[PDB]
């Protein structure tokens, strides 16, 4: 906390998960999904004595979803319904979790890079015009993961729920003309996994189903390291077929879908996104930087966010960057590739390295002047 006793909260409002705790913490308090829901009756599902409020939010909405219409208040990093985001924030700072007296707190937000303009304006508005925070800041996803890693140079590959961004930073200088956006991220892999499970004869269509298939994804999916050998394995032998139990108790069998779905990150056309995959799109970012910065960028690829957690993604991403470098820079000098120094920073804590980065930054700058936007400087 601050010297004035003011609590210094740090708060990621991802399209997937809220991740919100106090500065200087090594762990986030209170991970919960950015979800809002409303009670409905279904003729096919049991009703009981569990009290469902006229509106439910967050964790409770996600676990009671079987009797709720459910909505994600934010998509692609953009607020869709400000009313549901107000409810989600009201839950975040509410008695359920961080029971803070907001009028006395300092709050560190984050905003995705190259996001729409009026999105940020209305976020900063509500912090001073409804919660009355004593100070605000809007940090950048790229620099925060670098603070959590302690670095000053790297290329961040932040692959959240809604969208994936590559952002070079060199010796603390930003390189915003090199920022690259890839439209594939964890929400679309889940839409894609549904479309594949439909081909095995299952069905998933209700709003409550979207969260269930997300948990199937998180449990079973993995990035194939060498896609030819994964296809050979599925065709030659049955070992990939792994069961799952839906909340209705129906057993499903999941097979080669386990690696076909994540593969959209490396072959975007599989979900009708035109472009090149995350490995090539990253490489085309390094090769656009000034010639001598390139050899540092290859030594500090930094992964962040939950859609990097697929088993094998760093290993696969190394392989493609090496193949791209051998093909396009070394022109096939396969002996000379042995001199190529490449490091993919894959900390296991990387799922929360953005919030961890904010907790570092806010602890370094808890009481300084030019950092926090004060409510005294607001409304002018």
């Amino acid at each position: 906390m601050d010297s004035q006793g003011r609590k210094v909260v740090v708060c990621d409002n991802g399209t997937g998960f809220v991740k919100c705790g106090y500065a200087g913490s090594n762990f986030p308090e209170h991970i919960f999904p950015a979800l809002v829901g409303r009670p409905i009756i279904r003729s096919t599902t049991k009703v009981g004595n569990i009290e469902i409020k006229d509106l439910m939010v967050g964790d409770e909405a996600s676990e009671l979803r079987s009797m709720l219409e459910v909505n994600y208040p934010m998509e692609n990093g953009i607020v869709r319904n400000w009313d549901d985001m107000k409810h989600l924030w009201d839950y975040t700072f509410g008695p359920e979790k961080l029971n803070i007296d907001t009028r006395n707190c300092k709050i560190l937000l984050t905003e995705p890079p190259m996001n729409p303009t009026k999105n940020r304006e209305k976020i900063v508005e509500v912090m001073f015009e409804t919660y009355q925070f004593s100070g605000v800041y809007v940090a950048i996803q790229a620099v925060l993961t670098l603070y959590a890693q302690g670095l000053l140079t790297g290329v961040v590959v932040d692959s959240g729920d809604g969208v994936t961004h590559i952002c070079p930073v060199y010796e603390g200088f930003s390189l915003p003309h090199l920022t690259r956006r890839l439209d594939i991220a964890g929400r679309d892999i889940t839409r894609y996994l549904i479309k594949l499970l439909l081909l095995r004869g299952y069905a998933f269509n209700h709003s409550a189903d979207f969260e269930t298939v997300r948990m199937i994804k998180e449990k079973l999916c993995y990035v194939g390291y060498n896609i030819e050998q994964e296809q050979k394995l599925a065709l030659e032998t049955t070992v990939l077929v792994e069961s799952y139990t839906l909340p209705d108790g129906r057993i499903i069998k999941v097979g080669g879908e386990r690696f076909e779905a994540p593969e959209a990150l490396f072959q975007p056309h599989l979900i009708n996104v035109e472009g090149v995959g995350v490995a090539e799109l990253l490489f085309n970012t390094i090769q656009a930087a000034d010639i001598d910065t390139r050899s540092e960028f290859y030594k500090h690829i930094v992964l962040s966010g939950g859609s990097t957690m697929y088993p094998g993604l760093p290993s696969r991403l190394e392989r493609e960057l090496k193949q791209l470098y051998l093909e396009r820079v070394l022109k096939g000098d396969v002996e000379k590739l042995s001199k190529f120094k490449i490091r993919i920073e894959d900390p296991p804590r990387r799922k929360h390295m953005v919030f961890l980065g904010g907790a570092v930054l806010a602890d370094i700058m808890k009481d300084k002047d030019n950092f926090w936007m004060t409510r005294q400087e607001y409304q002018e």
Binding site: I140, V143, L146, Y147, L152, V169, Y170, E171, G172, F173, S174, L175, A289, D290, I291, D292, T293, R294, S295, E296, Y325, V329, L330, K331, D333, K336, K339, F340, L361, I364, M365
Partner: protein
């Protein structure tokens, strides 16, 4: 107590104490400023970088040389390089050391004045002096007569001296130098489809120039052999591991010294301008100048330049007499070494402009010593 000798080259500053035989610091005469906004706490975020520091951070800097063609074009940056030199390289308070500076011939006199104002008013040096670079070079070579061909990063000039008497009327100056060879190398590399357009990338083309280029002994034979057997090609490795290869560019580049119509200026090459400086001297002196043709400065470091120089002059001068191109190994530092000698001599100690004399007479005293 010791004198301080400081050769402000157009490319490399070279500074060190007198009475020793090599510069104590050599570093590039470069200042750089951040090209991008800094966005993290606890980075250096200095408003400028100097010398080897700027050269390391090069990837995010615009690089500027305060000197162009031997003229100091931005004094605000030039004092910054001197400040870095005294306090960080030599780690010495200049308020206690008399300092010997260097300048090219045929140079705007406001340069010498303003340079001397800076020394006495900003660095409070007890005394100072300004020496002609080509005259210093003879001290390092250990002789009292010769025609000196300096070619630095920014300027080329010829000064004949006989028995210690200079011939000011025979001085010839030519602003073709290592910079123009670098920009020209950048241009011709595009014929192979490389590109090096930024100010940072020019430092890589300089490093290619320093490492691969050589002067053709007979230019049309090198062109004919390159275009046929192509055994002349050499590779080079970029900072990112890309390998380029370059061929007849290795010798088309320094050939500009002999055929400056490559860059398009109509002047004579370094050979024929050297010959003209001799032919402007009196008849009796000409014999001794051919015998002591002294090369100096880093642009004369190209392999084969001493050989090509002798070939060219011998085609021009009467065949009845010997021509000897003196080119020591240390010719990069002959200017600085000459200052270390001159400042050490017991006979020189009266020639410093003292602070008392400057206070009585202002910057114009540099024209009188």
């Amino acid at each position: 107590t010791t004198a301080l000798v400081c050769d402000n080259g157009s490319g490399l500053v070279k500074a060190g104490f007198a009475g020793d035989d090599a510069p104590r610091a050599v570093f590039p005469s470069i200042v750089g400023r951040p090209r991008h906004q800094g966005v993290m706490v606890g980075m250096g975020q200095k408003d400028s970088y100097v010398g080897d520091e700027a050269q390391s951070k090069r990837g995010i800097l615009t690089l500027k040389y305060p000197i162009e063609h031997g003229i100091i074009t931005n004094w605000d940056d030039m004092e910054k390089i001197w400040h870095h030199t005294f306090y960080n390289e030599l780690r010495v308070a200049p308020e206690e050391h008399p300092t010997l500076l260097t300048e090219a011939p045929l140079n705007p006199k406001a340069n010498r004045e303003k340079m001397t104002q800076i020394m006495f008013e900003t660095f409070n040096v007890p005394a100072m002096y300004v020496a002609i670079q080509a005259v210093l070079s003879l001290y390092a070579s250990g002789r009292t007569t010769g025609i000196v061909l300096d070619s630095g990063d920014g300027v080329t000039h010829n000064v004949p001296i006989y028995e210690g008497y200079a011939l000011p009327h025979a001085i010839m100056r030519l602003d073709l130098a290592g910079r123009d060879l670098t920009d020209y190398l950048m241009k011709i590399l595009t014929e192979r489809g490389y590109s090096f357009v930024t100010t940072a990338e020019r430092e890589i083309v300089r490093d290619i120039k320093e490492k691969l280029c050589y002067v053709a002994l007979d230019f049309e034979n090198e062109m004919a052999t390159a275009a046929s057997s192509s055994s002349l090609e050499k590779s080079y490795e970029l900072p990112d591991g890309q390998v380029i290869t370059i061929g007849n560019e290795r010798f088309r580049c320094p050939e500009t010294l002999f055929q400056p119509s490559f860059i398009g200026m109509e002047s004579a090459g370094i050979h024929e301008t050297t010959y003209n400086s001799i032919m402007k001297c009196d008849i009796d002196i000409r014999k001794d100048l051919y015998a002591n043709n002294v090369m100096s400065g880093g642009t004369t470091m190209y392999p084969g330049i001493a050989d090509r120089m002798q070939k060219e002059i011998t085609a021009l001068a009467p065949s009845t007499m010997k021509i000897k191109i003196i080119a020591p190994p240390e010719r990069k530092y002959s200017v600085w070494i000459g200052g270390s000698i001159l400042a050490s001599l017991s006979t020189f100690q009266q020639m410093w402009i003292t602070k008392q004399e400057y206070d009585e007479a202002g910057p114009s005293i540099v024209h009188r010593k």
